[PDB]
Every structure is written in C-alpha cells, then in structure tokens.
C-alpha cells in the first residue's frame with residue numbers, strides 16, 4: 001500500500017504517505033525497474049486541475065485555505081483559462097512554486113536549504129539582450145564574492161503557437177571543449193556540442209583547457225544571440241593541495257557557481273522553459289565527476305603518476321588513492337579562497353536531517369538513491385544505508401529537449 | 405524505436421535494448437507511481453512456506469516453463485523427448501502433487517539461478533559452478549558431512565572454486581531442511597552488559613540461538629560459530645566445524661607496519677546458506693552456495709559499516725588523521741587503506757580475492773555476453789555499484805534494468 005521505509009544502520013522504520021499525492025508516472029512498472037535510467041524515454045480541464053491543485057497548495061502554505069481570497073483566486077484562474085486557454089501567476093505564487101519545485105527534486109542532496117531561495121521574476125523580458133542583463137544580475141547576486149547564495153531567475157512561460165525563451169547552455173558557466181581532429185578533446189568533453197554551436201554563431205574560440213563559454217540566448221522564434229560574460233563576474237578557484245606542492249602545477253581550476261540553465265520549471269501546469277537556478281557545489285561534483293570521469297577531464301592517471309603509484313594493476317587501488325587527494329584539493333582550495341563549498345559527508349548528514357524534517361512535515365520525501373549517494377565513499381555516508389522512495393511531485397524541475 | 409527499455413552507457417555513449425525482461429513472469433516492487441528500487445527486502449521480494457502443496461495449476465505452469473527452458477538450452481525444443489518430459493512431469497504432479505528433477509535439470513537450474521541473480525556482480529563465472537547433488541540426505545549428521553565436503557572442495561587450500569550443494573526439496577506434509585546460519589562461516593556476536601557487541605553485531609541473534617541450543621560461547625572478536633542444522637520435523641542440531649576446515653586470513657598492510665597489530669582477520673569462503681533456490685516451482689530450502697570474496701565486502705562493509713565491526717575511527721586514529729572534521733576526508737583515507745590491506749593480505753596468503761575494479765570490469769563483459777546471448781541482463785544498480793569508489797568503476801555509468809527471472813535464488817523467512 002504505502003511503502004515501509006527502513007534505515008539499515010539505525011533499524012528505524014518510516015512510512016511514506018506522501019507518494020500517494022503523486023499524479024505523474026515514472027518509468028518503472030511491476031515487470032521491470034528503470035530507476036537507474038538518467039533520462040525519460042520520451043487541454044483545458046487538465047491545465048485547470050493542475051492549476052487548482054497548485055493554488056490550493058499555495059493557500060494552504062500561508063494558512064488561508066478556504067478563505068475568500070482563496071476562492072476568488074480559484075475563480076480568477078478558471079476565468080482566465082476558460083477565456084484564453086492559459087493563466088498567469090502572481091509573484092508570490094511564483095516564489096512559493098519555485099521553492100516547492102526545489103523541495104520536490106528527488107535527485108538533489110542539498111534540499112535542507114529549500115526554504116532559502118532568492119527568486120528573481122524576469123517575466124517582463126522581451127529580448128535576448130534583456131535576458132543577458134537578468135542573467136548577469138543573477139550571477140552577481142548568487143556569487144556574492146564567494147559567499148554563495150541560492151537563486152533562481154524565471155523568464156516568461158511557454159505559450160501556445162509561440163517559440164520558447166531558452167538558454168542553450170546547460171549551465172551559465174561551462175568550459176569549452178575543442179575537438180582536435182586527432183581524436184582528443186581539449187577542455188571539457190561534455191561541452192563539445194555547445195562549443196561548436198557557439199563558434200558557428202560567431203564566437204572566436206580560445207585553445208585552453210578552461211575557457212569560459214559565451215551564452216547562447218534565444219527569444220521566441222529568433223535565432224539565438226551570443227553574449228560573452230564579463231570575466232569579473234565569473235569567479236574561479238585555482239586548485240592546490242595542502243601537502244602536495246606539485247598539485248598546483250597541474251594548472252587545474254573550477255568555477256564557483258553551479259548554475260543549471262536548461263531545465264524546465266513546471267508550476268500549476270505552467271511551464272517555464274528558461275529558469276536558471278544556482279546553489280553551491282558539493283566537492284565530489286568537481287573532484288570526482290567533473291575532474292575524474294573517464295569521459296570528462298579524466299585526470300586520475302596523471303595525478304596517480306605524480307603520486308608515484310603503481311598504475312599497472314587495479315589491486316593497488318591507485319584510482320581510489322588519487323581520487324581522495326583530488327577531492328581534498330577541491331575542499332582545501334575553495335576553503336582557502338573563501339568560496340562556499342560542502343563536502344559529501346556534511347551534505348549527506350544534512351540530507352538525513354532533511355528526510356526527518358520532511359517525514360514530520362509531509363509524511364515523506366521523494367529521493368533518488370542512485371543520485372543522493374555520493375560517487376565515492378558511498379557506504380561511508382549515512383544515506384547509503386537509508387531506503388528511499390522515488391516519485392514525482394509538482395511543482396517540479398523537468399528535463400526538456402535541446403532547442404537545436 | 406523498439407518497445408523495450410532503452411539502456412545507455414554514459415561513459416561510452418552506447419545504447420542497448422533489453423528484450424529479456426519480456427520473459428519475466430513475476431512482479432517486482434515498483435509501479436509507475438513510485439520506484440522502490442532501493443529497498444533491500446520489499447514485500448514483493450519476500451516468500452513464505454506453504455504447509456499444503458501449491459495449487460497444481462500454479463506448479464504445472466512453472467514446471468512447464470522450466471522444462472521448456474531446459475529443452476531450449478540443449479537445443480531440443482519441440483522434440484519427442486521434450487514432449488515426453490512434459491507429459492512425465494504432468495503425470496507425476498497428477499499422482500503425487502509434486503515432481504522431481506533429473507540430475508542434468510538440477511545442474512542447469514542451479515546455474516541459471518545464479519545467472520539470473522540481479523544483485524550479483526560475479527556472474528561472469530556463472531557457467532562454472534560445481535553442483536553437488538545432496539538430495540539423498542536424510543539426517544542432520546549427513547547434512548553436516550555434505551557441508552564439510554562442500555567447504556573442502558570450495559576452499560581448495562585457497563584456490564577457491566564456486567560450488568553449490570542441494571539438499572532435498574520442500575515436500576507436501578514434511579518439514580523443511582534448513583541451515584539456520586546465514587553463512588557457513590560467521591563470527592559470533594556477543595552482546596555485552598554495557599550494551600555494545602564484541603564480535604560481529606550482524607550475528608547477535610544466531611549467536612544467542614547457538615548458545616540456547618547448548619553451544620559453549622567464547623569471548624573473542626572472531627570466534628567461528630557452530631552450524632545449527634535442521635532435518636525435517638526435528639529440532640536443529642549443533643555441529644562445530646573443525647578449525648582446519650575454516651581457512652582464515654590475518655590482515656596486514658603492505659606499508660603500514662602497525663596494521664598487523666590490529667589483530668584483524670577474515671575468513672576465505674563466502675558461503676551463503678539461508679537462501680531459497682527455486683527451480684520450476686520446486687523449492688530447495690537448503691542449498692548453500694559459495695564463490696570468492698570481492699574485497700569491498702570485507703574491507704568496506706564488514707569491517708567499516710557503523711553497525712558491523714566499525715573500525716574506521718580506530719584506523720584513522722592510527723594514521724593520525726583529523727577525525728574531528730568531515731572535510732579532512734579521514735573516513736575516505738582510512739577506508740582505502742583497509743581495503744588495500746584486505747587485497748594485500750589475501751594475495752600474500754594465496755587465497756582467491758577480486759578487487760572491485762577488476763570485478764566491475766568483468767561484470768561489464770558479462771553484460772555484453774548476455775546482451776548477445778539473451779538480449780539483456782537483470783541487474784540491480786544499487787547492489788552492483790561498489791560501496792566505495794563508485795564512479796571510478798565502469799558500472800556506475802551503465803544504466804541497468806532490474807526484473808525477476810526464474811530459476812532464482814530467493815529470500816525466505818528465518819526458521820525460528
């Protein structure tokens with residue numbers, strides 16, 4: 001019926017009653033579980049039902065359900081949809097909806113912070129140039145000279161028979177990946193495609209490993225336009241290691257601000273195709289995935305050699321030893337630069353506290369175990385031993401197709 | 405394109421479709437409304453015994469399916485021998501309520517059970533399983549003899565060999581054969597008056613049952629438990645394994661000389677003894693099986709889990725790490741050195757062990773073999789990805805599809 005959920009380290013049991021509130025299908029069926037898949041394989045009454053549920057969530061949140069303001073707002077939404085096929089959110093509803101979307105995101109380990117989100121209303125944007133200005137202000141606010149603050153900027157919603165507002169880049173700050181025809185990639189191989197799009201739209205490329213990409217910004221039914229971010233706006237952290245003096249010589253660095261810009265924000269049936277949001281990094285994202293993934297910067301063997309490890313055999317655990325030191329260098333370097341960062345132990349501990357808050361608040365918390373457990377030191381963190389239930393609640397952040 | 409799950413490897417960018425899941429005839433725990441993939445023991449993965457024999461319709465359909473699988477495996481599907489075996493099973497069930505497997509069917513069935521196990525990273529080895537037929541066993545003393553022979557064969561003085569020994573199946577109006585212990589080799593867990601546990605806290609309940617049944621307990625951290633063996637409709641009997649049969653490896657570290665002084669050790673043979681082997685509707689409640697260890701099982705889980713031996717802080721203190729702050733990564737540093745000690749010690753002792761990198765690399769090869777052979781491979785990502793260094797292994801970047809195929813190894817309730 002409702003899932004019984006166990007923590008194997010503590011022996012404690014909870015029951016998730018919240019999942020009964022999900023109205024959207026995931027990929028699993030009783031025949032087979034597709035929980036480890038990264039992406040999904042793929043009128044008026046529906047919109048109105050999603051709108052009413054959301055308006056109901058909103059008036060409940062301010063302890064005013066059943067108030068006359070509640071009923072009048074439901075009548076406004078209904079009148080707008082019945083007449084125009086769509087409707088519009090008040091700013092206060094948008095703020096609430098953006099926070100709920102973060103709270104509802106099953107793959108985010110940072111949700112203890114969900115109530116602390118600066119929401120920028122950019123819905124009065126009519127051009128790519130205007131989008132750029134809003135983006136620069138977001139970056140400035142969020143960066144805050146290294147004292148990072150979570151934020152989201154919301155551009156105009158999707159509308160019928162009109163193109164979307166889109167940011168083509170997957171994050172506001174990304175490093176170029178240049179495909180040298182002799183196979184290799186200089187820079188970040190995750191970004192080869194976006195890099196080439198930038199060049200063919202007129203960007204003069206560099207040839208470095210850490211060249212910050214310009215933004216491709218698209219207003220409805222227009223070709224995207226190219227915008228170089230003012231270098232003063234892009235905070236970056238040089239990587240050094242507390243005891244290995246040679247580490248600094250690797251020339252490694254990463255940017256301070258993780259700002260995802262290609263997700264769709266869905267609130268009350270309305271869809272915001274451009275709504276970039278930013279937090280701060282957990283160290284393993286940079287140290288383990290971005291730097292050590294074989295299909296990313298792939299620096300493991302380089303670091304292992306500098307540590308004089310036996311690279312000839314798996315059983316020497318050279319990969320494990322190198323990864324630890326790289327992760328240590330990330331933490332040390334961000335701490336030395338006074339740039340906000342969280343290690344995976346601290347993060348997972350705060351997530352356990354979040355699960356407990358949410359059990360009391362809502363009777364559950366949607367969580368994707370495969371994403372919540374960090375990519376190194378899995379069972380050394382408390383989340384590994386915690387059973388989790390994954391389901392989709394709205395408001396939500398969703399994936400959407402690339403605009404090209 | 406095709407109406408089957410599309411499965412991507414994000415490291416290589418390669419795509420497959422699992423068509424094998426179309427053969428599953430048993431629901432897992434997930435629904436479109438919520439995924440329960442991370443649950444260790446959801447009710448859908450549980451079983452329970454029946455006193456009265458199963459509805460013959462239910463048994464016959466499972467039996468027919470398995471006979472069909474067997475005759476397909478030997479390339480004789482549709483043959484006269486295939487039809488005659490089907491008629492034979494149906495008549496057997498008609499007169500007796502159950503049926504019995506030929507020796508070659510049992511061998512095929514046991515191997516297919518392992519091949520089908522979604523939580524096993526060691527399945528590249530599935531075709532090399534020594535199947536010991538112990539279906540003639542009629543006493544706890546005889547079960548003990550078979551178990552000792554299994555242990556001697558499988559241990560092979562450190563050159564470990566995969567093996568399973570199958571005791572008589574569940575039968576209408578007769579008690580089960582059961583091994584009460586969860587593995588053939590386990591360390592005792594003694595609850596102390598302060599509330600803590602000396603030994604393996606995983607084994608507190610089984611330790612206390614052994615004591616209740618007449619075992620005189622030790623008081624060490626690595627005391628090997630006796631076996632509680634149960635023949636049909638009898639109280640379990642207590643058997644002590646002769647010490648020379650139980651191969652153990654003392655743990656040392658290749659460079660940290662003090663590590664040996666910690667007095668740690670682990671046993672060579674991982675031999676699970678409490679799972680149910682189901683083949684064609686027949687239930688083998690006692691069918692212990694053994695392979696060899698992957699190092700993270702010992703070094704990360706058994707030694708470092710907070711609810712197991714929990715040695716992380718002790719090792720980190722010895723390495724003079726800062727244990728007062730998360731960002732020093734002391735847990736990560738200590739864990740690597742413990743895992744290295746396990747690998748080094750087993751290699752020095754010439755006892756088979758596989759590191760987690762080598763194991764996951766071999767599992768990727770298994771996935772490719774199985775894509776060609778069967779059109780897929782049921783796999784539980786949470787269990788296949790190792791408990792340290794996850795994304796440093798190739799399996800982390802491979803999407804997987806999890807589903808239940810039979811023959812199968814299944815969980816069953818404790819006999820007490």
Ligand code: HEM
Nearest residue numbers: 102105107108109110113150151277278279280281282397
């Ligand atoms: C404040 C500090 C934050 C931390 C430490 C954090 C941490 C993380 C991590 C480690 C992941 C997995 C990322 C990956 O492996 O690529 C993640 C995913 C995610 N985060 Fe958070 N996050 C934070 C803030 C935010 C904010 C402000 C939002 C939105 C308002 C957000 C929404 C999401 C979403 C939707 C995902 C899933 C992305 C996907 O499915 O691809 N996070 N977060």
Ligand code: HEM
Nearest residue numbers: 518521523524525526529566567693694695696697698813
């Ligand atoms: C040959 C070397 C083998 C290796 C390296 C290996 C490796 C592993 C590992 C690491 C696990 C996860 C266990 C845990 O985390 O507790 C596992 C699970 C499992 N293995 Fe294998 N295994 C091997 C042989 C076998 C054999 C011979 C069988 C049966 C014939 C088998 C059947 C299973 C089953 C049924 C599970 C799931 C257990 C559960 O769900 O609790 N394995 N294996």
Ligand SMILES: CN(C)Cc1cccc(OCc2ccc3ccc(N)nc3c2)c1
Nearest residue numbers: 038170171258260278279280281282285
């Ligand atoms: C499917 N994804 C891997 C694609 C992708 C591309 C670019 C970035 C990305 O990150 C997801 C994400 C989202 C929000 C985050 C918030 C804070 C944070 N530290 N990391 C985050 C990471 C994910």
Ligand SMILES: CN(C)Cc1cccc(OCc2ccc3ccc(N)nc3c2)c1
Nearest residue numbers: 444586587674676694695696697698701
């Ligand atoms: C659900 N589990 C935690 C219960 C349990 C208790 C005792 C042992 C156990 O291990 C599972 C298992 C099964 C077969 C294996 C084969 C080889 C191997 N190296 N490890 C295995 C590990 C699992």
Ligand SMILES: C[C@H](O)[C@H](O)[C@H]1CNc2nc(N)[nH]c(=O)c2N1
Nearest residue numbers: 036037038370371800801802803
């Ligand atoms: C195939 C697998 O689902 C994929 O590699 C997932 C695993 N877990 C993850 N967890 C996080 N946080 N981020 C990821 O990109 C992934 N990738």
Ligand SMILES: C[C@H](O)[C@H](O)[C@H]1CNc2nc(N)[nH]c(=O)c2N1
Nearest residue numbers: 384385386387442443444786787
């Ligand atoms: C809660 C979670 O499912 C549990 O801790 C799982 C995770 N993955 C695992 N993976 C393996 N191989 N063995 C385990 O016991 C577990 N435990």
Ligand SMILES: [Zn+2]
Nearest residue numbers: 028033434439
């Ligand atoms: Zn699932």
